[PDB]
């Protein structure tokens, strides 16, 4: 009954234990037998131990009888069995052990009958090959020893108290003699408890801490850590620590984490000398290595343990190991990174107003060649060094003011690192979300977090409204500096400019932006400038007008210059010098950057871009960069005009003008698609895909029937040229590494453009065939895009998608026969790969899918018999089709088999002893 | 026979424990670096079918221009 009560009896373990104690008082043997059977049932065994067994039969024999009397229906036993009732049972089982020790700890524990019986039975069960017995008994023995450790600790405390009482009495006769005798009996009790604890440790622990099952090992490791924490003077020794140190090297990560937590307790307690010095020296390298454990959670715990060790002594960790931990702040795993950032903050940034800490952060960021930006570093240390990271005042003072007596002026590289770090901290404070790869960024901000973010944003705005003009002026020549600094206003509250009467500083900032657009020809600088002007041009903020005015002026000047330049550039007799081309190119780059983010349709710049582009088509000496930026600018002109022409009130004839512009520009992009320079073709193809999507049928789908004239259907030549660009550029020969990654990303975006055309029915589905044929070939490079395209095309038309897949397989087949003779073996890796891709396609079936696959099989057999024997050539393709035979239902199989029998008549079905085996295999599959 | 779990070897032999202590290369790994360049970080966000199929090939920096591409999508 006891097992049932513990399992779900909903009775306090104290009551259960007290009832068992009453039973022990009435008959000790009967209660002992009930306890033995309790442990047996807790292992899952349905047998019962007899009183004769307990009286004479050895524990090993009893265990064997219980194994044969198990009546098990499965391998599950209560401790492994999942479910809330069994979790409650595990907890109640451990509590029963603890309370049983507690209630007997002053008498029955020293009776030396029930305790010895229990330890004997538990040891025997810990030796059992049966995992249920071993597991349950080991957990019970560890819980029992924890309780015994608490009993022995209380005995030691009480002994110290009686010795203190005797000492007081000796200072001052029968009372002190009483006290001496009480100490004597307490020491006898402690020796008895020590015998019990030694029995459990030497008979169970030293055998189960190295158990084959990882669960058992974890139980033992956790409980030895508990003993060390509970009774440090008696269990915090090398004799006990060695087991944790050894099992730190266990291949299983669960056990490793158990070891780490056990150690964390002791290292938190700050005993230091408590054998922890020797353990640290012995296993320091192991902990440092665990910082890079296969299991990330184990690694975080190891880093936290290293921080604890640092709090204990600091210098013990040495600088090399600290640097190992430092590298982890750049890890993709945010837990590891923030633990390492905490370690790094405590190592040097904690001891320290913040100016030297800011300089040290800059120096650390520069010393670590791992990252080129501080986003992930700042993220790692944002929770720890928030006061330092938010000391923007000290940072911009370091960048601005320099003469500070003995302080050495920062190197230009250090100044760039500092503006980078300042920008990253500003961004993380303005938007309370981590950089990509660390946090989702789409989490509802807490009320506290929203208030903190608002305070940081106001401080940033008011400080840098004045700081940023100065910073931009000081670093106007340096391009990276001005880009990073130009990203700051996007994190400002522009209402602060008006409310805080800072309009003068806004004007200075605007003038600085315009100055650097005039000075700079770098694309990133000009992009940052147009982005900043766009952020500042908010009609809802009061500063709009001012900024807008300045914006207009800039454009005006640029436009005028450009026009003049072009008048000389596009002249009947004007051989362009490299300076002339550079002039027109720089002004064009500025105008393109601003036209992307601003409506420059007032300046009517389509004429200039079109003239440049057609002159590049005719003359053929036009600079490639000029063509690229002119393509982009004409694209933006058309786009902005489309945005304007959305109401009949706006215009009607400009709609026709816009249609003409778009068609002409599409022809120009098609011409530049067939260009020698790959970058020109890439720009034209990119813009062309975006144009085709923007001006597709969907341009009228949502209440935009007035835009119905403004549609462009890709002509067959255009579709062919786009697919040819994909085939020539995206799919290439499969072969520093970061440059390869960048190239792969550009190719993926190109492929995704054409695939967007496919999935949104802008182009024919059949084109996708070629893309689909490269699904396995470029699974890593483009397989995600090909998979998404294939699924979308399935949803569009499953029957037509099946046709395109069979076309891809047919394309692989005749490509194989073109590369290698018709003697190709079925085992040849090429044909096997075609069959593998066919299986993959086949996985992609009663929801009209049966109809589509019937059509697929029809096309397959028609292809097989399309080429007849010269004295069927594509008989082999039947094997390919056999990959899809399984998805075909028997009822539909009859019809497709009728078609197949019509193809081979009857003689062929009989003739299959040699190379006709593919036909017979497909015939069987049917 | 019976489904009862009987482990013939209950213990890790001393040789396997010595091997665990001597070589822990199987249980260590290299550092998975977060995006080191700004461009790789931008590709971490912008790249990927979820964003690729919903974003233009030529980046449009004003939401008004982007809205055209997006409204044509689906």
């Amino acid at each position: 009954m006891l097992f049932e009560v513990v399992k779900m009896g909903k009775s306090a373990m104290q009551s259960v234990v007290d009832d068992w104690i009453e039973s022990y008082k009435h008959d000790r043997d009967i209660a002992l037998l009930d306890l033995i059977n309790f442990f047996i049932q807790c292992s899952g065994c349905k047998g019962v131990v007899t009183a004769e067994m307990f009286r004479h039969m050895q524990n090993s024999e009893i265990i064997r009888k219980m194994t044969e009397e198990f009546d098990e229906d499965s391998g599950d036993y209560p401790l492994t069995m999942a479910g809330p009732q069994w979790k409650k049972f595990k907890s109640s089982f451990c509590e029963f052990i603890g309370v049983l020790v507690r209630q007997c700890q002053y008498s029955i524990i020293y009776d030396e009958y029930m305790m010895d019986t229990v330890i004997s039975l538990l040891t025997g069960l810990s030796d059992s090959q049966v995992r249920a017995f071993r597991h349950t008994s080991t957990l019970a023995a560890m819980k029992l020893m924890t309780a015994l450790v608490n009993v022995a600790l209380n005995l030691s405390i009480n002994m110290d108290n009686t010795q203190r009482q005797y000492e007081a009495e000796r200072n001052k006769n029968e009372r002190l003699e009483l006290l001496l005798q009480k100490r004597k009996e307490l020491q006898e009790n402690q020796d008895e408890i020590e015998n019990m604890m030694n029995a459990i440790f030497k008979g169970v622990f030293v055998h189960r801490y190295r158990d084959a099952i990882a669960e058992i090992r974890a139980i033992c490791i956790e409980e030895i850590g508990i003993w060390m924490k509970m009774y440090s003077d008696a269990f915090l020794n090398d004799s006990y620590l060695k087991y944790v140190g050894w099992t730190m090297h266990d291949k299983q990560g669960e056990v490793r984490l158990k070891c780490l937590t056990a150690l964390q307790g002791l290292y938190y307690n700050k005993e230091l000398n408590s054998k922890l010095e020797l353990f640290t020296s012995r296993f320091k390298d192991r902990i440092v290595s665990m910082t890079l454990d296969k299991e990330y959670d184990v690694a975080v715990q190891a880093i936290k343990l290293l921080t604890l060790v640092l709090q204990s002594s600091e210098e013990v960790l040495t600088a090399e190991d600290c640097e190992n931990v430092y590298h982890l702040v750049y890890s993709a795993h945010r837990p590891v990174a923030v633990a390492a950032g905490e370690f790094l903050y405590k190592k040097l940034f904690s001891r320290r107003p913040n100016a030297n800490l800011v300089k040290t952060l800059v120096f650390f960021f520069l010393e670590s060649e791992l990252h080129e930006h501080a986003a992930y570093l700042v993220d790692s240390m944002w929770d720890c060094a928030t006061e330092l990271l938010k000391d923007w005042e000290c940072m911009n003072s370091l960048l601005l003011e320099e003469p500070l007596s003995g302080e050495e002026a920062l190197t230009d590289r250090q100044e760039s690192a500092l503006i980078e770090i300042m920008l990253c901290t500003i961004r993380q404070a303005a938007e309370c979300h981590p950089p990509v790869g660390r946090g989702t960024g789409k989490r509802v901000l807490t009320a506290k977090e929203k208030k903190t973010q608002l305070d940081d944003r106001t401080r940033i705005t008011e400080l840098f409204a004045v700081a940023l003009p100065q910073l931009l002026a000081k670093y106007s020549v340096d391009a990276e500096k001005v880009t990073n600094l130009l990203q700051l206003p996007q994190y400002f509250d522009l209402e602060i400019y008006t409310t805080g009467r800072l309009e003068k500083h806004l004007d200075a900032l605007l003038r600085q932006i315009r100055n650097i657009v005039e000075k700079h020809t770098d694309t990133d600088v000009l992009e940052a400038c147009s982005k900043t002007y766009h952020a500042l041009c908010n009609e809802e903020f009061t500063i709009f007008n001012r900024v807008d005015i300045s914006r207009s002026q800039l454009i005006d000047e640029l436009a005028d210059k450009f026009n003049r330049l072009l008048e000389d550039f596009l002249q009947e007799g004007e051989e362009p010098d490299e300076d002339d081309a550079y002039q027109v190119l720089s002004t064009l780059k500025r105008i393109t950057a601003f036209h992307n983010a601003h409506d420059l349709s007032k300046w009517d710049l389509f004429a200039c871009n079109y003239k440049l582009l057609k002159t590049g088509i005719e003359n053929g000496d036009m600079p490639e960069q000029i063509v690229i930026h002119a393509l982009q600018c004409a694209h933006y002109v058309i786009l902005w005009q489309l945005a304007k022409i959305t109401e009949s009130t706006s215009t009607k004839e400009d709609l026709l003008r816009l249609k003409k512009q778009m068609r002409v520009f599409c022809q120009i992009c098609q011409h530049y698609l067939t260009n020698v320079n790959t970058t020109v073709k890439e720009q034209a193809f990119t813009i062309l895909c975006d144009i085709l999507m923007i001006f597709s049928h969907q341009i009228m789908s949502g209440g935009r029937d007035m835009l119905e004239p403004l549609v462009y259907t890709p002509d067959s030549s255009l579709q062919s040229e786009l697919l040819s660009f994909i085939l020539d550029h995206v799919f290439i020969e499969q072969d520093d590494e970061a440059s390869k990654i960048e190239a792969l990303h550009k190719r993926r975006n190109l492929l995704a453009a054409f695939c967007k055309l496919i999935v949104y029915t802008v182009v024919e589905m059949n084109t996708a065939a070629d893309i689909f044929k490269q699904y396995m070939k470029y699974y890593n490079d483009y397989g995600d895009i090909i998979k998404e395209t294939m699924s979308k095309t399935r949803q569009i038309d499953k029957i037509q998608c099946a046709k395109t897949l069979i076309l891809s397989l047919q394309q692989l087949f005749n490509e194989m026969i073109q590369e290698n003779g018709y003697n190709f073996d079925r085992s040849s890796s090429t044909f096997s790969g075609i069959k593998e891709l066919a299986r993959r396609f086949a996985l992609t079936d009663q929801l009209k899918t049966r109809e589509a696959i019937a059509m697929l099989h029809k096309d397959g057999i028609e292809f097989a018999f399309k080429e007849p024997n010269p004295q069927p050539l594509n008989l082999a393709f039947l094997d390919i089709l056999s990959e899809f035979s399984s998805k075909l239902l028997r009822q539909d199989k009859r019809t497709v088999y009728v078609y197949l029998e019509k193809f081979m008549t009857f003689q062929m079905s009989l003739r299959r002893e040699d190379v006709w085996l593919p036909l017979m295999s497909y015939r069987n599959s049917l | 026979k019976r489904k009862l779990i009987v482990d013939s070897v209950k213990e890790l032999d001393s040789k396997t424990i010595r091997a665990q202590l001597s070589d822990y290369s199987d249980i260590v790994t290299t550092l998975d670096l977060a995006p080191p360049t700004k461009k790789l970080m931008m590709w971490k966000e912008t790249g990927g079918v979820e964003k690729l199929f919903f974003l233009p090939a030529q980046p449009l920096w004003n939401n008004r221009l982007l809205k055209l591409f997006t409204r044509c999508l689906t």
Partner: peptide
């Protein structure tokens, strides 16, 4: 020294009376 691993098992001598392990 204590941390140098020297344990070995499966060659342990079986206890005489498994029923009384606390004998001493």
């Amino acid at each position: 020294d204590e941390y140098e691993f020297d344990e070995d098992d499966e060659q342990d001598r079986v206890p005489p009376v498994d029923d009384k392990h606390l004998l001493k």
